[PDB]
Amino acid sequence: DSSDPIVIPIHNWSSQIVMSNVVGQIFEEMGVAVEFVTTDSQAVYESVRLGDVTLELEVWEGAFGASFRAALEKGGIVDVGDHDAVTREDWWYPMWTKDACPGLPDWKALNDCAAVFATAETGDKGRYLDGPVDWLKHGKERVEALGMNFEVINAGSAAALWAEIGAAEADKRPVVVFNWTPNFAEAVWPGEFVEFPEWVDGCDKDPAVGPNPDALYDCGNPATGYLKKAAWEGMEAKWPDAYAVLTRISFTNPQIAEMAKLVDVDEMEPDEAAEAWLEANEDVWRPWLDG
Ligand SMILES: [Ca+2]
16 A cells, blocks of 8 residues: 555544544554544535545535535546445434424424524524534525525534534423434434425436425435445555455444544543544454454
């Protein structure tokens, strides 16, 4: 394998940053140097395509599938394979919300009960709290396409999502906020995703699909989204061994939810958790090296 270091992008939610460090140490284990960089979560696909960054370890189908597809179409990035995980990223509510709006999880119920989700800032509209803007791109677009009486506010971090959900528990205040599985949160605050329109092939390209035959983004995200691994086209050539390990690398829901939990509940630094997780789970990743 080449002497050039492998460049691993790090973003702004817990499993991704832990997973990234877990994998880095694995690569180092077999003698490949690695370097980390923090990047915007949507823009990283163009960077991988160009080889400014070597790979991406968490290609969520829902949030990043379009940017991935777009890079792939341009050329220069490679679908290395999928983790054995299935993902869902969407508007979500803690279970007590049903008390206020028992038509849920139907998205039409959500909208019917809109005024219940209003905050001082949205006045008469329901408040949806999205995550950082480099995640789900099209909240506002989805609201307009489905013609919902909601307004969208982007949280400044993942932690603000957990703050809001947690802070609504005491008075069982209805809230709807961005969330995903696998992840630690649902285990803390049981709930459900809003059932938006079923994702179908090319709802982010073809208006004729979805409850709005005249515009895009009227679909909810995939209920069984993939979680892919992407690589720069040059990676297999330069680091065949690291690339081969990368094709074998596969984390599951439980492992991912656990990694998230280590930062968000147990309050560990992502790199500390990664080193701990590795040491505690060498039954997991060893065979990826062939041993
Ligand atoms: Ca449509």
